[PDB]
A paper describes a structure:
The first characterized [name] representative is [name] (OSCI_RS22075) from the cyanobacterium [name] sp. (formerly Oscillatoria) PCC 6506. Peptide arginases are weakly similar to the well-characterized family of conventional arginases (EC 3.5.3.1, also known as l-arginine amidinohydrolases) that hydrolyze free l-arginine monomers to l-ornithine and urea.
Here, we report the first crystal structure of a [name] at a resolution of 2.6 Å. The structure of [name] reveals a three-layered α-β-α sandwich arrangement, which is a fold shared by all arginases.30 Apart from this similarity, the macromolecular assembly of [name] shows major differences compared to other arginases. As confirmed by analytical size exclusion chromatography, [name] forms a homodimer in solution. The narrow region occurring in the center of the [name] homodimer forms a large surface-exposed cleft, which presumably acts as the binding site for the 10 kDa leader region of OspA. The base of the negatively charged cavity accommodates a binuclear manganese cluster typical for arginases. MnA of [name] is coordinated by His12 and Asp43, whereas MnB binds to His41 and Asp167. Asp39 and Asp165 complex both metal ions. Interestingly, the [name] structure features an acetate molecule that is bound at the substrate binding site serving as a mimic for the guanidine moiety of the actual substrate. Furthermore, the established arginase mechanism features a histidine residue that serves as an important proton shuttle. This histidine is replaced by Ile73 in [name], a residue which is unable to perform the same task.
Author numbering:
A (entry chain B): 3 to 306
B (entry chain A): 2 to 306
Amino acid sequence: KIPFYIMEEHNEAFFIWHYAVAEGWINKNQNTLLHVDEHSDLVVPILNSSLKSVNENIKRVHDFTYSELTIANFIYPALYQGVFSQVYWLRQKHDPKLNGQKQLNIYSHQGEGKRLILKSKVDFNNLFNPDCKSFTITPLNAQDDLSSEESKKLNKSVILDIDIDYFSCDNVSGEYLEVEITEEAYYDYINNLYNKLRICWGGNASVKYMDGKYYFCIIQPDKLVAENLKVSEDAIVERIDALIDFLKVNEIQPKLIDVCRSRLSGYTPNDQWEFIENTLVEKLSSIYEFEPIFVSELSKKVLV
Amino acid sequence: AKIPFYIMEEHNEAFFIWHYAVAEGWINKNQNTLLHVDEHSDLVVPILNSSLKSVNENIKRVHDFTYSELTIANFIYPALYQGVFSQVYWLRQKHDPKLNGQKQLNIYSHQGEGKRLILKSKVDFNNLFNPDCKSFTITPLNAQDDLSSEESKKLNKSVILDIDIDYFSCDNVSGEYLEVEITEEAYYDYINNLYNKLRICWGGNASVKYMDGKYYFCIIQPDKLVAENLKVSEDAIVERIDALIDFLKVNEIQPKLIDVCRSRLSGYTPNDQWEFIENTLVEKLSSIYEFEPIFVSELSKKVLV
Ligand SMILES: [Mg+2]
Ligand SMILES: [Mn+2]
Ligand SMILES: [Mn+2]
Ligand SMILES: [Mn+2]
Ligand SMILES: [Mn+2]
């Protein structure tokens, strides 16, 4: 049986990886992240906690995961800790400019493990620096014919990290961020000349009134440049089958599989997420042996 | 002849002052130089709800737009798109070493509507004779720079002296700190729900706080202690004001309009220094220029009548 885990939001993947190392399902380091997602999740985080200290025990990892980790900044931390030595990002259609391997290195400011710094060329000072980790991020497609040399390089301690929004996505519902505010806060935003929030926070940011309630729209997606990434149930099935073929052809045997719904964040359509998860698990069960366990089960063992 | 001199609280108000200066005829409609003396570039490209073509119609319209869609960092490119300035010179204490020489840039609006601004490094073939497309330069400067006669000649044309007092002494941590009053429901969902969208999207870059029976959502800097401190001493401030006054004398700068921004309500200028910086700056500017400083409120007064 392959360890198989399902989470609501992607930051939880960090907790699952460290749990797997603790139980010994995957190795301490030199693992491969097969990151199957519409988004790269390669935001370089600044953290309050040192990633050196977070690693010590699983209870500390759990608290960090649901505190400082976002749904787009959870990979570079795992790379800085040396959990993965190479990342393969699988997408429906990649940007044309970005193609082939990318030789990168990550270190923290003054070795504190708080402010991560990304570089293409390894600095002379970071030569034989334990803080500095070298790795490669590669853009792949499910329809890519992979060479015998490239196939060998990918197939080393593989973690199959799948976000359901890979198959069908809604960036408009996903990007949109709001918080309910008081009438006093709403009024000051519009009418106060020097309301810091209006004149210091740009983009599409706004305040709105609905149902006798007030909201600060922190982030509104640009609907003019928004692509229609929501596809039919047939297109989803086709896309899931294409992933199975990529895994079959490259003879991928994961040491850990994790699935992210991304339906509470709204990136996966709310009327599809059940169909995509159910169909994926069915299709994954045809080539792999596993028992799907919800991430809550891991939390309960840690909290007690 | 006195130089029109206007003091404002926040930098978005500069846009209003520039268009007022055009309407009165203190400066020309176009081909002005923006001498931008500030710690921050204020070169955010804004996507707007109002067309910048329509905003320019009358001064009331400009005033409404300034206190609506503008931020303290996106007020320059709208003025460049409207053709108010043909070149910007950014005066900073210490620039990025990579940033050298004049940057040949052009700005145009999506479909010529004047709502969505698009910034480019080279003029697109379609925008070669397009009157919606404006060509300009943005150049870094230092107060210690000795300009050539060719350089000084190029720069010293219809100058607007645009000073943000955060150039002399700055606090980016105080300036970047934002908080908004939220409801009980919003506060307790953030606290109890692990999948609350504010939590999972922003993590340690945001937080919530309870103060005097009220709830706030706060945008915060993680590892705040390690963040840079640009707050300097009064002596350093005086030395830096003298350095500017010397640069203005040496290059024989005679501004058609001076505007000063406090940035103390936004908190970019330290609250214990802003009065000292402003008073010293105005005192040492009067040693090389003749003017009577007027607060931006007096301009707003006339428009709303
Ligand atoms: Mg706005
Ligand atoms: Mn993801
Ligand atoms: Mn995703
Ligand atoms: Mn400014
Ligand atoms: Mn400034």
